[PDB]
């Protein structure tokens, strides 16, 4: 249609609020103050296409996974109501994170003020994915140790809310704070080292390794490090400027890594409930 027509522009002609990654030389959407043109742009080829679909698709994948999990027969749970509530909080944080991300990446080029509002929601979503993911994990690890379980939930909440309050700062969105952003979220996620150490110094090195928790927590740590390292350093567009504009740039890979990370985190706590279901809800040991 001949309505709301636009062409991709090079980086140097973008306004300062749109300039973010200088290694993405061309394929930029121009400032378009129309949500009609913004949502319509989803079907077009530009820097944001990959960022958008990885989290638009990821959002509906987790929406389906979330619904399918709530309709699981209550036979397969020890406490089906509270066990569905902890899984629900993870899926909730996972859906909100992806929703805010694909929405931000879509409306990004609307206004300087629209991008300021949705960028704050984009950062807030990440913190919600991290807090929500801890909920089922602490519930299963510290099952017959309720007192420490609830303490760690207060800790991650206070750190998660501090992350949300810091992401509402204007200087946080500036490209000079790319590493600060990666560090704030990386530290929040890596704070799981505290309950992990408690788990291994209470249940032992044998029980933590036999159940797979150690090997699984190492893979998660790797995804956090590799995802932050890529995002902060801008690899590989730093090495091939102008060659990774539409595909495989650091932000797009980090997006892929979020849905991949959230899926393997679900697989971990999914095996933690399967294991608890076999042993029962009792406290014999």
């Amino acid at each position, epitope marked *: 249609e*001949f*309505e*709301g*027509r*636009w*062409r*991709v*522009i*090079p980086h140097d*002609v973008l*306004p300062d609020w749109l300039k973010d990654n200088d290694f993405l030389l*061309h394929g930029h*959407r*121009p*400032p*378009m*103050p*129309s949500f*009609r*043109a913004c949502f319509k742009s989803i079907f077009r080829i530009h820097t944001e296409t990959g960022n958008i679909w990885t989290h638009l698709l990821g959002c509906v994948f987790f929406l389906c996974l979330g619904i399918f999990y709530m309709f699981r027969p209550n036979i397969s749970f020890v406490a089906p109501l509270q066990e569905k509530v902890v899984f629900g909080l993870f899926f909730l944080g996972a859906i909100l994170c992806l929703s805010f991300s694909w929405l931000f990446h879509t409306v990004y080029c609307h206004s300087e003020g629209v991008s300021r509002l949705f960028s704050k929601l984009d950062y807030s979503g990440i913190a919600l994915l991290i807090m929500g993911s801890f909920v089922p994990w602490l519930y299963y690890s510290f099952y017959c140790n309720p007192q420490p379980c609830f303490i760690y939930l207060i800790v991650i909440c206070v750190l998660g809310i501090a992350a949300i309050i810091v992401s509402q700062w204007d200087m946080f969105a500036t490209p000079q704070y790319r590493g600060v952003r990666a560090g704030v979220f990386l530290g929040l996620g890596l704070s799981g080292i505290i309950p992990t150490l408690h788990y291994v110094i209470s249940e032992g090195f044998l029980k933590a390794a036999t159940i797979g928790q150690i090997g699984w927590l190492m893979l998660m740590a790797s995804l956090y490090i590799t995802g932050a390292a890529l995002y902060a350093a801008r690899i590989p567009e730093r090495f091939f400027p102008g060659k990774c504009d539409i595909w495989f740039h650091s932000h797009q890979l980090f997006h892929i890594f979020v849905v991949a990370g959230a899926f393997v985190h679900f697989h971990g706590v999914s095996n933690l409930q399967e294991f608890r279901f076999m042993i029962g809800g009792g406290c014999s040991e």
Partner: antibody
Amino acid sequence: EVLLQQSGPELVKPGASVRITCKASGYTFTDFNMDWVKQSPGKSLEWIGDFNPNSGGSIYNQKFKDKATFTVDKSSSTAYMELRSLTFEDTAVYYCARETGTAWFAYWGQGTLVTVSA
Amino acid sequence: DIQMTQSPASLSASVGETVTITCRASGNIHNFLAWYQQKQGKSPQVLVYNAKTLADGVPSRFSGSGSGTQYSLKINSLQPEDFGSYYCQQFWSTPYTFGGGTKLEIN
């Protein structure tokens, strides 16, 4: 600095055909679209059409479809607008304007005055 | 076609005064509006694009506002160089249309 340099004034007979030159400089020619605007004496601006130096595609205003033709020389970075079978109504200042993603014009040629005299 | 209507047709205001030129569209143009100034015998110059964004070099005196079909260009503290013909343009749909113009005349 971006610079759109247009051809000099023309004084043509009725029925003849003019060709306006638009030398673009100071940027990568194919990155943006080029538009053509007509300004009748003491009158408002009128859009003739847009041209894409990269694809070749050009969208004309229905009013001028049979009157104007947009052509290009990518090598010299020069846009052309050819007006066919001129009439007294065609006596106007013709500008070339560059787009910047969306069709708003930050860069304008100095204009070419086409005078149809008999 | 989208008819762009410009009002007032002309106005004369003293230096230091605030003036408002309005512009209407015959249908929604989704903020894809631009304002241009034109000095006699000179090429037009963009002032405001995307309804409210000020172009580089343009002073803060110029202020773009509006939404949907009704738009405005307010000039605070008029200066002797502000004389000329003002034009609004929609770039939402083809053919891109301009307003008739407003002739501003400083005295």
